[PDB]
Design a protein around this nucleic acid. Structure first.
Lengths: 122, 62, 142
RNA sequence: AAGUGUCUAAGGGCGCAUGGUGGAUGCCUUGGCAUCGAGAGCCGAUGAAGGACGUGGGAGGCUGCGAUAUGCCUCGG
RNA sequence: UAGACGGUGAGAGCCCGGUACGCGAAAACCCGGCACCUGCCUAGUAUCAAUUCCCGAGUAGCAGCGGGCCCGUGGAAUCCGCUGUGAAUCCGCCGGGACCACCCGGUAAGCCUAAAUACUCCUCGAUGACCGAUAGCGGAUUAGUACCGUGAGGGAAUGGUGAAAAGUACCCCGGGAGGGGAGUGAAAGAGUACCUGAAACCGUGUGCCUACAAUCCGUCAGAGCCUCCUUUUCCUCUCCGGAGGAGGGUGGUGAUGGCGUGCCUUUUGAAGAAUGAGCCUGCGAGUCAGGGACAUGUCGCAAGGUUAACCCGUGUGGGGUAGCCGCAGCGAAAGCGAGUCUGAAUAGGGCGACCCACACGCGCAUACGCGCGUGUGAAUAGUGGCGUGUUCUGGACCCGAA
RNA sequence: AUGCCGUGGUGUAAAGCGUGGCAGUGAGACGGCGGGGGAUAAGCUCCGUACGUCGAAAGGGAAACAGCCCAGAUCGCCGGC
RNA sequence: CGCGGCACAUCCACCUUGUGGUGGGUGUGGGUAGGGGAGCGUCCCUCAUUCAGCGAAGCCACCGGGUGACCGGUGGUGGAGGGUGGGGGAGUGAGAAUGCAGGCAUGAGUAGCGACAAGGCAAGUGAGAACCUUGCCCGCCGAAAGACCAAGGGUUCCUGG
RNA sequence: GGAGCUUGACUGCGAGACUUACAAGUCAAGCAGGGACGAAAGUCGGGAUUAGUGAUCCGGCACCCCCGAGUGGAAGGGGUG
């Protein structure tokens, strides 16, 4: 019973290549070189989605800091004040507010300033 | 085509009526002047195979 | 029919094909080494160079008698339950009931209370067998 | 005045459309391997096996054939 | 009594060659039968006295050296061979595992002997959970050829048009090959370099990015264009379309930022400046026999189980009881038996038999259980086949030495 | 001082023991702590720890970094501490 | 930690309450050598069934689906053998052995083109001429680059195409 | 250290433990027989302990009816030392 092992292998070849399309040079043409890249690419996606989440926090923080400085207040005391106020609002939508409605951001700043106690002593 | 039994094992080990194999001790065939009767009694008799090589011995006999 | 005919559940274990990738079993597959075992099977006898147990231990004492006529052993308790009515016990009858190897001489053991008063036409009875047979009321033969 | 400011593709990259090279896969077979059963189990100094040379109306080889030469005679199909 | 296969323009019982089945041999050969021919016997069978001879000769046997038989000169028989010596013919001689007395058996050194058994160059008929052109014999084709080698020897590649050649008339470019137009053709997207026609590779057309910018040549964010497309301002031309565009969503491309040291093997340890791979396609590496062994799961039976060789028959079924494992083991062995051995005995010890929520008869006990029997229904198992894993001898996972 | 054996409680999910089947390992490295060999030496070598990590563990930090610090990735999330 | 989706042990209550499963809770789930468990897929025989020249296999592109190996539909090419399920059996899955057979790449339109004897012009055949033919010059070996035999080769000699 | 008498520098066993990969090594109260010292109780299975040793096969001496290749014997083999 000779089986002619071409077909079964071709399923892998055409699948991996059609997914690997777009890669430069001997990456989107060669099965055995493409296969390497899918391994590296997918390990990269695996860690990059998580890093992406952290990255977006970094961006949101920077923008909040910018608007906060426009209202003459730091990010530190901003978050401290909002926590004291119980305003459990995430940094994503807070940074959104910074653009959609800067006045609302100013209002939240006044709330934080009022909620903050007096100084840096305890 | 057909299994062989190790002739030395068949000439040194004795299977009992159950799943046990015993070993003859005889470190007493060369010099017997310095050995006390205590030692020769330790060697006299027949001793069950220690469980540390039965998985090998049973295949050597069979 | 054949299209409803199925194997028994738990039987027909699939053959673990060995050298078919890392997810199936492995590249080295059992022989995960580079020494002798990787390339060939060492005789089970060889221990390493030191004297194996086959020469280390002393030769089993004694010999074997060539002229040893081994007798088949008949359980008197089996006689008790097999022939509760007694009457007569022949060797052909006992082998007809399958209690002893065919075409062989026999002996009688006494391990078992004998109540059947029956004479036994056979060979080589033990003294305790005579005690039990005469207890029942029978007679020993040879 | 000072500043913002698209547009170049010599020639490369990626992806589509369409061709070429190659003859893999699929399907097949003028062909082979391994077996059961049944025969024969020898040829040859009457010149064996196997070959060179040659033979056809038409160049060469294979199969057949031997100065009677891709054939002759006889009994049958 | 034909539905086996194959072919015919596609999957045919009824189209065809055939099959089932029945016929069929002048002549030759083989076999068998018949007749002729050839060839053996004018008995030694039986009862008996046992005077005499005979029953295979440089043989047997012995000794020495060797072979081989499980038998490695060893206590070494039987058998064979060589070398020296060297007997007897029934009150004999040799063998029955050194050897000797007794006992049973057969009469050597002379010849022949079919069947049962093994094998297949070759020739029949059939089969196939065998191959389908890098497989099968190396050889499907000018194959043991071309070719290599002083030579012995070594030893390739090349299959497929189409149902039918109907192998593209004729015309036009071109020296021709080649191509286009016509035409046959179901189809030329089947044209001799040809069924199907992938990839590497080459190249063209075109959407998009790129000439101040370094990073296994990716991933994730991610603007702007391109293409597809929904709603919609809007064109009112509306029985049409949706043009261009905002917004939304696919498929490409991707400015620019972040992150990030090829794969395999071997290594204490690798991105590698350790090795290996130019790429693509195809080929290829833990498998099998055996009434093997060990263990395990399922399936037959149930103190049994099971048949091998072999016979019958038509598919692989029915028979076949020789044998195997189990059933009682211990001991060097004799041997005896739930005991057995060492041992004066075992008081002890090696090995194996015997587990109750409990009644009845019975001794002991405050209660609780020791023991002989039946159960208040109390405690249990091997064997064979098919699988799985391992293992043994078999080339033994494959390739590779000098 | 720790550590070891055993014992009575508390606590704990599997960790242990015995008997079987089938393999691997049988070349270790570094750091911390005690040593010895050495030169008061070494990214040297040889020992012990129920001391750890790598080996066989990605991630964050040490600028870069198998062995140091924190921490043991089932998968997803444009959510937090 | 939170919010959802898979899985493995143990446990709670159930359906054939250790064969086998349903709802829920807790804990667990990095992993090479290695053990174990459960599967996909190519080919082939058989049984049931069945699409199929109103177009299968194979191949190509697209859109979808599955935790994964992988699968389906549509359209195109092609033009005759494949699907589903229960079973059986493997010459069964290649990314690597300085692997093999075949084809094509990079190197690259790079090197090299073969004694340090030398070619040139005209006319002409011819679609096309440095290289062929016929003339005129030049040059070279000339004890060899000349002229005859042997071995060897086996028609390579001449004509015509 | 010293003195008198002696030979347990024994026989057949030894539960149960340590130790250890295995082989191997090591200790063992107590019991039967028989004996020594001891008026007795009691000690004694070599040396205050640890070093003074060498697996298997084969061969040799003595002993034990264990077998005895048809039987009875023997060769030879087997068991104990």
């Amino acid at each position: 019973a000779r089986v002619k092992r071409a077909v079964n292998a071709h399923k892998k070849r055409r699948s991996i290549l059609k997914a690997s399309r777009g890669y430069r040079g001997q990456r989107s043409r060669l099965y055995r070189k493409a296969k390497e890249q899918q391994l590296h690419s997918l390990n990269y996606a695996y860690r990059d989605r998580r890093a992406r989440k952290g990255e977006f926090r970094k961006l949101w923080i920077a923008r909040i800091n910018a608007a906060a400085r426009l209202n003459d207040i730091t990010y530190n005391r901003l978050i401290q004040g909002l926590k004291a106020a119980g305003v459990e609002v995430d940094r994503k939508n807070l940074a959104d507010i910074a653009i959609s409605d800067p006045a609302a951001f100013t209002a939240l700043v006044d709330v934080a300033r009022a909620a903050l106690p007096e100084d840096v002593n305890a | 085509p057909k299994a062989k039994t190790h002739s030395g094992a068949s000439k040194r080990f004795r299977r009992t009526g159950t799943g046990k194999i015993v070993r003859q001790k005889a470190n007493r065939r060369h010099l017997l002047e310095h050995k006390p009767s205590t030692r020769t009694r330790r060697l006299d008799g027949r001793t069950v195979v220690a469980a540390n090589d039965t998985k090998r011995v049973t295949s050597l006999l069979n | 029919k054949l299209h409803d005919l199925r194997p028994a559940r738990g039987s027909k274990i699939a053959r673990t094909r060995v050298g078919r990738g890392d997810g199936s079993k492995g590249k080295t597959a059992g022989r995960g080494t580079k020494g002798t075992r990787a390339r060939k099977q060492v005789p089970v006898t060889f221990e390493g160079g030191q004297m194996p147990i086959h020469m280390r231990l002393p030769k089993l004492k004694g010999f074997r008698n060539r002229f040893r006529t081994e007798y088949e052993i008949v359980n008197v308790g089996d006689i008790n339950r097999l022939f509760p009515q007694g009457g007569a016990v022949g060797v052909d009858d006992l082998v007809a009931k399958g209690a002893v190897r065919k075409n062989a001489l026999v002996k009688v053991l006494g391990d078992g209370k004998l109540t059947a008063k029956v004479d036994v036409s056979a060979h080589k009875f033990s003294g305790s067998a005579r005690a039990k047979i005469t207890a029942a009321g029978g007679s020993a033969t040879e």
